[PDB]
Structure formats: structure tokens, C-alpha cells
């Protein structure tokens, strides 16, 4: 589906000769409010056209996320580049408390109780990779129990 | 209350000196160091050798800096 959310806008450039050609980039994540997200990056020549391009690439190559219901399954920790990310599920009344670019991922996924923090280099185009290695590699235990459930899930 | 150490000195008169090892843990780094302890056990009969393995206990002070005594020699 489609619920859109913008994060970043830049002004990249390019020197040719004579002057300097400008261009705009944008980063936009799209989710469904249930656990299907997708991010997208587009470059164009103006703001109202660079956002439209980044929205279209978001709703291609999406991710199914197996959330527990407004929370996560377990504390995990993933990294990409020089960016390290930590996330652990929380109680009911606590909302989402994260920084800038992990709120926009964790809104549209539908989770509400995420309690996150990012270390290392804060790059909004690169902390998103650090988040999607984490969420796309969840497990959601298909087991008979948890304190007993290590005889039917390990064979899954 | 009863300790155990090994003798390093026979130079003084009726006075012996022990080493009592000890493993205390470091308070913040979680590792067991070894830090020593050196007492003056009151010898009584001038008959212990450098390198023994003896046993001490605490009495009232006999001279200054000498309040421990000798229980018995355990092994040579």
C-alpha cells in the first residue's frame, strides 16, 4: 500500500565548465502501517519532482517485517557502514523514542514501542540500511513454547 | 580465625616473618589480582627455617608491630 514519509533533502552539485550545475536528491520511506515497508532514493532537478521519483522506487523492492504487534521480538543490534544501531522492545505506554531517521522507519512499519539508539556516524541515508538489516532478519518463533520452544523452532 | 603463610626471614631474635598471599578482586574491572601481606609472627623457640609453611593466630601485642604468634609448623 502507501503511506509516505520524507526524511532528507540535499543540494548536490556538478562542475562542468562555465558554471556549476545543481541537482536535488531525496530519501523517502513508504510503509503500510502493518509491517510492510520500503525506502527509496531519487535524484532530479527540483524539489516537487525529486520527491515523486523517490516515492515510486520505494513501493518497489519492499520488505515484510514480522512484528509482535506494536513491539519487536527481542533486543537486537545491527550495523552497516560506520553506523551501529541498537533496538529493544519496550512497555505499552512508552511511544517511539529514536532519532530523526529511525522514527520514520519505525512509524510506517506500525511498531510503537521500539526504544532505539544509533551510534557511530549518523548518516540518514545510511542508518536506514543499518535498520533494514535488523528488521528483515527477524524470526517470529514458530514454536510450541519459548522456555520450552527449542525442539520445533530450531528445525525451522 | 587462623591463617597460613610461608617464612621469609630468620634474622631477628625469637621473631619470624611470613608472606600471606591473597586474591582480592579489582572493584571495577572484574579480575582477581594477587596482593601480598607481610606480618611479624612472634616466634617462640628460634627453630623455623627460611622456606617453611607455618600457621599463625592473633594474640595481644608482645612487642610493637608483633601481635601474631606461631601455632605449629605444618610442613618443611
Amino acid at each position: 500500500g502507501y503511506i509516505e514519509k520524507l526524511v532528507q533533502v540535499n543540494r548536490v552539485a556538478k562542475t562542468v565548465k562555465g558554471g556549476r550545475i545543481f541537482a536535488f536528491t531525496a530519501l523517502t520511506v513508504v510503509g503500510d502501517g502493518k509491517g510492510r515497508v520500503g525506502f527509496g532514493r531519487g535524484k532530479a532537478r527540483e524539489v516537487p519532482a525529486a520527491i515523486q521519483k523517490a516515492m515510486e522506487a520505494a513501493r518497489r523492492n519492499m520488505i515484510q517485517v514480522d512484528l509482535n504487534g506494536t513491539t519487536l521480538q527481542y533486543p537486537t543490534k545491527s550495523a552497516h557502514g560506520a553506523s551501529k544501531v541498537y533496538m529493544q522492545p519496550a512497555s505499552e505506554g512508552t511511544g517511539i523514542i529514536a532519532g530523526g531517521a529511525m522514527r520514520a522507519v519505525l512509524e510506517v512499519a506500525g511498531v510503537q514501542n521500539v526504544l532505539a539508539k544509533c551510534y557511530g556516524s549518523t548518516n540518514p541515508v545510511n542508518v536506514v540500511y543499518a535498520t533494514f538489516k535488523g528488521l528483515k532478519n527477524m524470526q517470529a518463533p514458530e514454536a510450541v513454547a519459548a522456555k520450552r520452544g527449542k525442539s520445533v523452532e530450531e528445525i525451522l | 580465625r587462623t591463617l597460613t603463610g610461608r617464612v621469609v626471614s630468620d634474622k631477628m631474635d625469637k621473631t619470624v616473618t611470613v608472606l600471606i598471599e591473597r586474591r582480592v578482586k579489582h572493584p571495577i574491572y572484574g579480575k582477581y589480582v594477587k596482593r601480598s601481606t607481610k606480618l611479624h609472627a612472634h616466634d617462640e623457640s628460634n627453630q623455623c627455617r627460611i622456606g617453611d609453611l607455618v600457621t599463625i593466630r592473633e594474640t595481644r601485642p608482645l612487642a610493637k608491630t608483633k601481635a601474631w604468634t606461631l601455632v605449629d609448623i605444618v610442613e618443611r
Binding site: - | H26, Y29, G30, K31, V33
Partner: protein, 121 residues
């Protein structure tokens, strides 16, 4: 570093020092003034800043800065200085409270009067 090195030489946290070295742990300080220069700023500006030099009750001889729009500050007059680092001028590290002892504030000012010390009309 391994654990068996930190036991032998633990991590010693480095310390800073005060950007206001005079007026040792106190918010204000008085002093009598000596000279009223009018110096020039650094390169990317163009102005003529007004700088007085003060001898405190500590005995220190430090330059200061005077704000506002016009000052009555003839020499040998007491002031009351406070901290504040002017980025423009070099060596200037202290402002000067208006309206406190001798500087007597400014006049015809109606925006932000608790700064610079102006009354209410």
C-alpha cells in the same frame, strides 16, 4: 587495551580549565578602569569596537568590552564586569554590566531593557 594492562595503569580522565581564568568561581566582579581604547576587529568585519582595560580587586589587569550605544565611562570609575567571550576581538574575554554602578545604562530603548538596564516608561 586488554584488562591486564588497565589493572596496571588505569584510564585517567583528562581535565579542562576555565575559559574565564580571572574572577575565580564568582559570577560578577568589580574593578576600576584604566584606559578606554577603541580598537579594530579581525579581518572579515569592518568596525571600530570600544574596549576598556580594568584593574580588578584581585590585582589582575584584563581588557573588557562595553556594549550599548554610548558610554559615559571616563577613567578611574568603578565598573562591574562579568564573563562573556567576544569572538570578534582578540584578547577580549569580559563584558561590562550596564546600569549597575557607574555605567548607568542606555536611554530611549524599548526592546530588551533588562539587558543594558533600562527602566519602564
Amino acid at each position: 587495551a586488554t584488562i591486564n594492562q588497565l589493572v596496571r595503569k588505569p584510564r585517567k580522565r583528562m581535565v579542562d580549565k576555565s575559559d574565564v581564568p580571572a574572577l575565580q568561581n564568582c559570577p560578577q566582579r568589580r574593578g576600576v578602569c584604566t584606559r578606554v581604547y577603541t580598537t579594530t576587529p579581525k579581518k572579515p568585519n569592518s568596525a571600530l569596537r570600544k574596549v576598556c582595560r580594568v584593574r580588578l580587586t584581585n590585582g589582575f589587569e584584563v581588557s573588557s568590552y562595553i556594549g550599548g550605544e554610548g558610554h559615559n565611562l571616563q577613567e578611574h570609575s568603578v565598573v562591574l564586569i562579568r564573563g562573556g567571550r567576544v569572538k570578534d576581538l582578540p584578547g577580549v574575554r569580559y563584558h561590562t554590566v550596564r546600569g549597575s554602578l557607574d555605567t548607568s545604562g542606555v536611554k530611549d530603548r524599548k526592546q530588551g531593557r533588562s539587558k543594558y538596564g533600562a527602566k519602564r516608561p
